Symmetry: D4
Subunit: 113 residues, 8 copies
């Protein structure tokens, strides 16, 4: 269980050392930051697009090395997409989800993909 | 319910702001315009090729961000392909279909893909 | 002197037999038709973007087979860009230039690239 | 003079309508925010990598449509890189430079590339 | 029912006007020509590789425009692969099959893909 | 049944004449060599990543020419992945498996893909 | 002096072990055989397109490994293009030139690219 | 002065954190080990191909982020190629050069590209 950065922006503690992945993650941080300022549709579309794109790219990256933890990782991703598709305004959940997802599930593939 | 441009050619009111998508749409406008001048096989092949290519590309673009409205959008596309594969010479239907498809279904993904 | 279509849209007489080239060409017809409707910045941008992109892509196709007429063709394209970048509103010139460019200069690469 | 966001993160007012460009831009906001938190080599590397990559990619997008403002834009980008390669810690300059670059120089290519 | 070229090499009567497709077809002609000179394994491997590659590429090309005649065309291809995988030395069959396949089935997609 | 190179590193007797394939194989040799020095997780992750990547790439290469021996070859690959996912420290098995796999199963596709 | 095949088609003695290169080479044999049948513009176009494309692609393969014989090889290719661009109908020269080019100059890059 | 591995193979101390770079580096260790076993043309070709390809690819990675140390790094690589193109059999030099190149010059781009 990890601290929540305030302002809710990416920092180097989240580095995975996959620069594409890090740069995509910076966009998910910003997406949740916007929602945290104004819970509207422009902001949710922005987070949703970036989330869908990042999860699919990262999924491809895992598949390229036939990663053993893919299926568990894809199921995590798909549950979060689902929250976003039924958004409830729960920004705290999202701030939390992303921090733990990166620092636990994404950190797990390092060196394996 | 939108006006039908006369001559039946693309205009900037159809811009989606995805330049690839706009350029592909210009070819569907021209395809229906040819048919409207001469309902023959060279012209239907031309529209059919451009339609099949555009729908698949746009479908890929939607898939890249895991778009929530994909399945409804693909079903729309597939119904129109089907009309083209059983062409009946109904050019008015086609002039209409395309205008509404862009201005309603395609305009819906803007900002999300 | 080739006939100028009316409406100024692409027709199958312009076919080069390269489907990507033909699809790009349709966007150049459309750009000149919009300017003929309203000589403004939006329309000139649309045409200028599509012209720049088509000229570059067709140049790349030429280079891929080390086409012997490349230099002369590139020079023809660059001269038209200049005209678009110093636009004086002469739509008639543009309408003519495109019809003659396709049917005499683009048609000469058929079978060689 | 445009307002400087606080927190210094991207917002939808910076939208260019090119999703890849906007996603890159978010990483430049983030790089300058990290430096504002701690002026060190890690943070400067992160910003400098993301700036180098975004400038190159946006230059390639410009070239693909033979954008007429390419030279001047490239020169603006190269001048900023120089500032990053001779970094003196002036975060205020950087914060300003990015906001003005996006809203005045990047915004001028919209519709042309 | 078409003539069999002697020597069994491609000629311009087989042009489909898809240069990639034509160049791949030239390799199938050569493959059958080798077998016709020496029915051995080096020669069958050579034809088999080129055949498998060409059929898959051409299948992709058909899929890119959602070609209506794909399934019939793929079934043709797959039957010929199968003959090659159970080769019987019947070179006349192969000389024949290829000529008709191109001039009837492949000529059918022209203008549609 | 082939000799095991000592030191357990690739040599030109393993050349398949597909340079991509050879270069990937060099990484599997090194992976087993590390494990042979220290049976730890950094080393198994390294072999596992390289193995998964190589098997998928080689599988793609086979698929591109519709290789007849694909399914048998993929089943071989998938069994070895499975050993690696349930590693038992049996380095001798692995030194052996790889030598025979290349010199028998991989050597079989030469000239066919 | 290597033997000149009759019919002037590629055979497995010309194998370079690079499947894309060998497949391109087959199209150069074919281009010279067509000219030997009928010295016309169609045939010369076919050969000239395939020669330009093969020379460029093989040059790109050379460059990808920073091949030390690149300059000399490129010069050999450019000299042949010149001969095709100043075509005098000397098919015998062409037949010889290709056999010697492959077996002495192309064969020297084997294992180095 | 860094230690020279024995056997002269890559180990995880050489990790750059760029998986493609690390996989290429393994092929350079292998090339120098083969030469240490037998100083012949086959082995020198293998090393020289892998060195040329790795240097080019790593140069392209550097350029993609407009890496400020590009020029100096390229010069280091070009000097080694020269040594390989004027090979005198000094394997000791090579063994040293690679260890120092990776651990001092390649390591300096980490986080910047």
């Amino acid at each position: 269980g990890f601290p929540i950065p305030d302002p809710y922006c990416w920092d180097i503690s989240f580095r995975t050392f996959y620069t594409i992945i890090d740069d995509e993650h910076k966009t998910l941080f910003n997406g949740i930051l916007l929602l945290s300022q104004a819970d509207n549709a422009d902001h949710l579309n922005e987070l949703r697009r970036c989330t869908g794109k990042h999860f699919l790219n990262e999924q491809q990256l895992m598949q390229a090395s036939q990663y053993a933890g893919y299926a568990e990782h894809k199921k995590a991703h798909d549950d979060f997409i689902h929250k976003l598709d039924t958004w409830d305004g729960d920004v705290t959940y999202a701030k939390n989800w992303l921090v733990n997802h990166i620092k636990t599930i994404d950190f797990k593939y390092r060196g394996k993909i």
